[PDB]
């Protein structure tokens, strides 16, 4: 199986006048790249997906695509729907575009059967010839993909090769490489970054990263490396600043992080989101000053 | 100027027994001429208002377009009755659903359903932008649809209550939240408020304790019941709806065996009121056992035809 | 079936000194009964049960029936445990001690199944020859028992007459008198004590009712008329209290209520309850000077 | 501080005509004994401590400290309650009786404020001199012992040494050892025995251990020497019985498994706990066979 492992990083995606800021946008990708991460990820939750329009969401996947050109990092590009035949149009895209596979994550807000699950990502994985992997994040869609149907999703299709778990269910990630070890299993969570990686898990879909992607790279490549006492030191540092990047809904506190270390011009979101109170902004801002994030 | 003085001026509004419009396929497109056979159905058996492409309406997996033509529909088939569409045009991106809301606005739409942003999670403060953005974007009545299930997020009682003083156009919430609690805090700190039940099974609780109205998954399948189950209510005779709320708690519970509109559009196909039981992936057909759970509840009731 | 309902209180137990402050409580029984209340629940949740000895236990029973002899008002005895054996030897007691009944909650902490529950339940009816209501209370005890449990034991038990519901559920409400409509289905939650009565429930188990006894009298015995409009009208009105009761964990803002109105001496509880935070104990205070309070 | 760490075993309590079967009670702890166990735990949870008489209580902890003695394998009793007065008798007990330590959970079902569990624990810690576990399994007591609670308890109480978790949430095992990387983090939930050792917990308080002492036992100590690998093999083999255990709720499954292998006379619970049914009778059986189950 191909696959996309090691840390990476859930992009924000700036915002300047109400447009993708898509010079900023490589600009901090190629900070990405500086900074030792093995992937990227345009487009997901942390983009806000769900506010930029159908031709944003290509634009900031092919910035991605460019900017990695002449690196070994590679972009797993946002590309999961709600409707299957939007999920299919989107990972073609990113396939006839050159990104290297394809983040989708479970359908949101419509609640699909795990057999619904099943035809849902068994459409998505013919539809392409590039790595797929899921993403179950229940808190957000209101469904699950079981082990079981994630299991038979990597067994039964060539393409799919893991999931992103963002689930806070460590027995889960247990289950789920007990009963397949092949299986890629990423942590969407960076407060767990290093029990799922412990675990077996190959890699991280960062949101700390964004702001300290040194340290989350570190942190990935060290459990990679089985140097489990130096990925656990760097998790145990990061807490403070995981926790409280979701303080509030993310992207609301990455993004005022970015803001205030002067790392995107304008802390500017597309509604529903919007800034947090001011009392977070202040928590955020207190937090950031125990960590040294890099500049450009 | 804006004002926090909103509550007691006039507010245009979409109340009574309402039937969140199931959305038949054909060959992988709407089937427009069932739609509008479903909805005379509808308007027949004493339901007061049709909400088209909403959840129930499998409205993720339509396009665009197919959600503009179906609210045509309903628009077009409500109109000489005494029924209001009250369209489906919420997203969670607020430019989208104000673009929605003004769809619905300029194209006969009585009022809009909007649901609260899903996936993404907006803070009770972009909420409140978000539903002022939409109310500010047209001159009808706004319903908010509290479904945190689905969203993943929740409109809180100061939230709507917020909304429904500060915003000409919004004048209640459809509540899907098994949160009973919570209809008594609505309706204690804002009575103006209409607080419209959106779980079948508990259409006469939230009725009796002043919900104005329904917007109901049942009805596509038993309209008569759900509408005399709501004016029975509406009239203060508690008795007889109480007794029709019992009575289809059956059915109430086993349309949701599954995650609506799955089983709903299963028993419509079962009472032979669409041709084909055809979903939009990921949704899909039921389980056999399901399937035969569905079919067995429906023995219970008496399903009107066309 | 022999049944208890109507409006009843969930007596709090006065300390003094670390002891049980008998005369206080004998005072707070007749308050309620001269001012509505149909029945009273002593050593309930209410009351402080877990952490009472066997005799005080024993010894508060006593107290209410004694006080409510020569009156209308019944005797509702707490006689639940966990462990089936005590639960049984409580219902004995309250029984060979005149109660007019027992209230059991479902066992708490050791999680039994629904056949344990059933089991649980049957030898207790089958001890004594009173009305045993049931009680569901999963945020407390760590289990539920489901509408069938319920409706079995209340068909396959003479003396179970229903139950006492504190589950924030009104579908279940819905489900059970649809299904067994001769239940006694009464409100264990303050909030919503008029829409499961509007449902045809036919009582409240009342944590309000310690301070306003006359309001959810007379909203209990409107709602039991189907005076509606009136009934609702005290819920309605009782929201803002009935919220503030349980700001922290009951009994500790009711006992903070009753000590703030004058009609016990001594805001004192067992370990591990304690005094409220000073913050909510002014907030308890605020609430409580929108409403009518009656003294002795 | 004073600690008490390592593989250690939830005792399951058998019966024998309704009495304690004192005798198995013995040859059991002397397998565990034999089977590379750090310490037993009598009259916890899996040992049916709620419906133990008091003097059954106390005589578990006296035949667990008489078999014991001369052995290394210590003895951390169960002492527990939600009466502060019981729970500091039982310490009292236990400590005046030869236990090492005592694990204490957190009230349950009355729902302690965090300001009422210091006060209960600090109550614990100051009447005994031995080492103090907490015990936070808030899916059977209703509340939650916060991270801020266990670390101030941890800091300000010298007997106090950390906190036996069953919470289901990796985040809090991170949060814990993270701000206050001295306390013993115990894992109480089999199936991810793996993770919380590999974040830096220091041993297991566990049900599956009843049945494959050597199992449980080789996995903590593998992973206390920081042999990762070997601990996860064993973890992710124990899975599928780890999960099988909560099929009902525990100990109901570990007593039919012990049961089922010979290891116990009767499969004999006190109500309100019951045998399985009979589908999961049949589903421990099968789980079973997978595992090499060591005699006597
Ligand atoms: N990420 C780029 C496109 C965003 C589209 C959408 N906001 C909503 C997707 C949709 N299926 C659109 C249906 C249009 C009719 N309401 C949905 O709203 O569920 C989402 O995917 O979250
Ligand atoms: N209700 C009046 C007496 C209170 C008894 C007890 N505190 C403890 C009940 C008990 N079964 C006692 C077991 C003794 C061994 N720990 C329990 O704690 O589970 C309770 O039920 O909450």
Redesign the interface.
């Given at each position: 199986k191909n696959i996309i492992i090691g840390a990476m990083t859930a992009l924000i995606t700036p915002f300047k006048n109400g447009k993708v800021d898509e010079q900023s946008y490589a600009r901090l990708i190629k900070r990405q790249i500086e900074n030792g991460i093995d992937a990227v990820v345009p487009v997901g939750?942390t983009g806000?997906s769900?506010?930029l329009t159908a031709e944003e969401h290509r634009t900031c996947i092919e910035i991605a695509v460019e900017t990695c050109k002449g690196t070994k990092v590679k972009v797993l590009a946002g590309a999961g729907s709600?409707?299957?035949?939007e999920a299919v149009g989107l990972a073609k895209f990113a396939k006839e575009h050159g990104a290297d596979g394809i983040l989708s994550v479970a359908?949101?807000?419509?609640?699909?059967?795990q057999?619904?699950?099943y035809?849902?990502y068994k459409?998505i994985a013919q539809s392409v010839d590039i790595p797929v992997l899921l993403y179950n994040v229940p808190?957000?869609?209101?469904c699950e993909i079981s082990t079981d149907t994630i299991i038979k999703l990597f067994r039964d299709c060539e393409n799919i090769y893991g999931v992103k778990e963002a689930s806070?269910?460590?027995?889960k990630?247990?289950?789920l490489?007990?009963?397949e070890?092949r299986m890629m299993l990423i942590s969407g969570?960076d407060?767990?970054n290093?029990?799922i990686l412990?675990?077996?898990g190959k890699g991280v879909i960062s949101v700390t990263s964004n702001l300290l992607p040194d340290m989350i790279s570190a942190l990935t490549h060290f459990a990679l490396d089985?140097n489990?006492?130096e990925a656990?030191k760097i998790?145990?540092?990061l807490?403070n600043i995981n926790?409280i990047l979701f303080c509030?809904?993310?992207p609301?506190p990455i993004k005022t992080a970015m803001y205030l270390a002067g790392l995107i011009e304008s802390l500017e979101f597309?509604?529903?989101?919007?800034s947090?109170?001011k009392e977070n902004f202040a928590k955020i801002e207190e937090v950031m000053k125990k960590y040294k994030i890099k500049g450009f």
């Amino acid at each position: 199986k191909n696959i996309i492992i090691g840390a990476m990083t859930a992009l924000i995606t700036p915002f300047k006048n109400g447009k993708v800021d898509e010079q900023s946008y490589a600009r901090l990708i190629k900070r990405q790249i500086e900074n030792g991460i093995d992937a990227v990820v345009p487009v997901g939750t942390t983009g806000e997906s769900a506010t930029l329009t159908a031709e944003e969401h290509r634009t900031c996947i092919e910035i991605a695509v460019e900017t990695c050109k002449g690196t070994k990092v590679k972009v797993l590009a946002g590309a999961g729907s709600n409707a299957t035949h939007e999920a299919v149009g989107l990972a073609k895209f990113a396939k006839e575009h050159g990104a290297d596979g394809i983040l989708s994550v479970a359908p949101y807000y419509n609640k699909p059967t795990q057999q619904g699950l099943y035809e849902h990502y068994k459409a998505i994985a013919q539809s392409v010839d590039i790595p797929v992997l899921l993403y179950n994040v229940p808190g957000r869609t209101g469904c699950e993909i079981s082990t079981d149907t994630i299991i038979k999703l990597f067994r039964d299709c060539e393409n799919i090769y893991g999931v992103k778990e963002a689930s806070g269910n460590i027995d889960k990630c247990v289950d789920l490489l007990a009963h397949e070890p092949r299986m890629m299993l990423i942590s969407g969570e960076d407060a767990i970054n290093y029990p799922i990686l412990s675990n077996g898990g190959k890699g991280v879909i960062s949101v700390t990263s964004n702001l300290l992607p040194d340290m989350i790279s570190a942190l990935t490549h060290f459990a990679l490396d089985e140097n489990y006492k130096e990925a656990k030191k760097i998790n145990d540092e990061l807490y403070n600043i995981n926790k409280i990047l979701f303080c509030e809904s993310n992207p609301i506190p990455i993004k005022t992080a970015m803001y205030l270390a002067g790392l995107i011009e304008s802390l500017e979101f597309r509604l529903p989101l919007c800034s947090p109170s001011k009392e977070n902004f202040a928590k955020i801002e207190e937090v950031m000053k125990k960590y040294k994030i890099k500049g450009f």
